[PDB]
Amino acid sequence: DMPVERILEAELAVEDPVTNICQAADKQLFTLVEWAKRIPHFSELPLDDQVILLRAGWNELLIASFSHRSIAVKDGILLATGLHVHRNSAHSAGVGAIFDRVLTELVSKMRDMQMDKTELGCLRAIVLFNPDSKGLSNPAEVEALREKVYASLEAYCKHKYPEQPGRFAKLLLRLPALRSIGLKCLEHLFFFKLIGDTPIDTFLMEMLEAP
């Protein structure tokens, strides 16, 4: 069983500019672990698989969260630290292109369709249960959990938004953009680490370790 109520509960339970953005990511990594612990059946996976799933998914998971948080704001993102980063600020720091991808492909789209917190929660839980993550002891169990999430998300969408039969697919079809943006963000992060001019705290640094 995979109740959307429990997924939304997990969401509500956890509620230069580049330096500020990196501090925010580190902060949210601690909170992400608590979020995942509240997603049904995650804690029952082998500890090594929980580690694999979180190491695989943390960036997409956290990007989805700050993007949805930012729907109330125009041309900016809202960090968990209470700081706002304006598009102009991101551009002036040399990271404008990737910032605009976040605004256009994620925030604006989430805004336009009025994606709700249950829907966000379920998309994130799908990202979490990524059965393609390398090294999983039982990929089939993770696949089964993902299937349970999207079965529950679709049922929710049909009941809450019956006037929008394409809504469930539209939610799922933000995932390629999320994947691409997560990968580009990670590339920047590795560069920041390489040049060494940007402080990176311990948990974010740990996530940048090789496996």
Binding site: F30, V33, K37, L47, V51, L54, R55, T202, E206
Partner: peptide, 10 residues
């Protein structure tokens, strides 16, 4: 991955 393991334990 020491921080992650610690946090997952409890």
């Amino acid at each position: 991955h020491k921080i992650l393991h610690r946090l997952l334990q409890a």
